[PDB]
Amino acid sequence: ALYEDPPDQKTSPSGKPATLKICSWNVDGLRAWIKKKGLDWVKEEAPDILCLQETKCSENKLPAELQELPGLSHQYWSAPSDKEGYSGVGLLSRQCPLKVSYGIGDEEHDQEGRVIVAEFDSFVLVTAYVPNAGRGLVRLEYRQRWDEAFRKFLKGLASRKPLVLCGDLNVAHEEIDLRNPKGNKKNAGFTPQERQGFGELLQAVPLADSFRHLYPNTPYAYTFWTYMMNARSKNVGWRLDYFLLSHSLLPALCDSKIRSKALGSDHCPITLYLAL
Ligand SMILES: [Mg+2]
Numbered sequence: 001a002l003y004e005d006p007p008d009q010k011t012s013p014s015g016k017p018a019t020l021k022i023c024s025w026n027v028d029g030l031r032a033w034i035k036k037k038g039l040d041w042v043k044e045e046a047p048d049i050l051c052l053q054e055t056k057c058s059e060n061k062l063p064a065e066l067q068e069l070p071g072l073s074h075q076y077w078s079a080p081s082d083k084e085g086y087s088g089v090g091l092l093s094r095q096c097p098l099k100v101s102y103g104i105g106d107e108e109h110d111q112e113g114r115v116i117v118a119e120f121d122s123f124v125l126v127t128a129y130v131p132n133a134g135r136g137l138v139r140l141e142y143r144q145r146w147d148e149a150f151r152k153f154l155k156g157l158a159s160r161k162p163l164v165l166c167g168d169l170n171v172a173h174e175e176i177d178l179r180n181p182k183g184n185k186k187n188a189g190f191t192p193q194e195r196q197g198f199g200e201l202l203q204a205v206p207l208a209d210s211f212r213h214l215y216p217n218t219p220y221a222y223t224f225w226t227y228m229m230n231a232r233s234k235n236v237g238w239r240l241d242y243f244l245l246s247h248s249l250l251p252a253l254c255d256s257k258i259r260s261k262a263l264g265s266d267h268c269p270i271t272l273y274l275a276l
Pocket residue numbers: 028054
């Protein structure tokens with residue numbers, strides 16, 4: 001019932017050394033996260049680009065520590081206009097992007113600050129916080145609508161450059177991605193409608209589940225554990241955080257990580273190495 005994240009593999013399949021280290025983490029709140037010393041572990045990872053989801057904090061109410069991160073001086077936030085402590089995503093980068101835009105260009109789905117998109121010389125990075133279908137699946141329909149707006153949106157960006165999607169995509173693709181498949185098929189995150197919406201995304205915007213791509217058979221690898229009953233302690237989790245990317249980027253895929261032990265949230269960070 002235990003999992004050990006293999007060592008960082010920092011070379012491409014052609015022996016090309018990694019040049020980019022992208023780190024994605026669902027902070028469950030910037031302030032609750034800072035307090036748990038998550039901004040600590042980040043300094044150690046020293047990524048090139050750091051995507052954060054569920055910042056629970058507008059861009060104007062940013063903590064002083066953040067702007068004062070060591071290398072990530074090109075920050076970009078996206079929070080719900082008249083809300084707080086709800087959703088929110090950020091994309092800090094050591095290098096300044098070519099262009100940055102927010103949302104997926106579809107009025108109904110750009111109301112909750114969930115997507116940030118940054119274009120870089122060789123590719124376009126897109127961080128996201130897919131909307132949870134909530135308890136009682138009361139937002140399942142909206143989710144099914146979002147899934148499509150996003151899938152379609154992604155395919156367009158894809159037709160311009162190779163694509164990379166870092167983020168909490170609220171869904172455990174296969175039974176191996178969650179500790180309790182047999183009993184969550186009716187709960188947000190593992191419903192047919194969602195699971196088979198993730199698959200159809202990988203299949204339509206030529207996208208690969210970087211982790212499962214490299215580690216087709218590793219189980220118990222999760223990125224989320226409910227604070228309820230120390231689920232993390234017993235490793236009863238869900239792999240909801242991903243790094244999906246264009247098939248034309250596999251040649252540059254070095255490794256895709258799952259920082260199982262970094263604390264600071266109810267999600268463990270996940271890192272990605274690419275040789276560009
Ligand atoms: Mg949360």
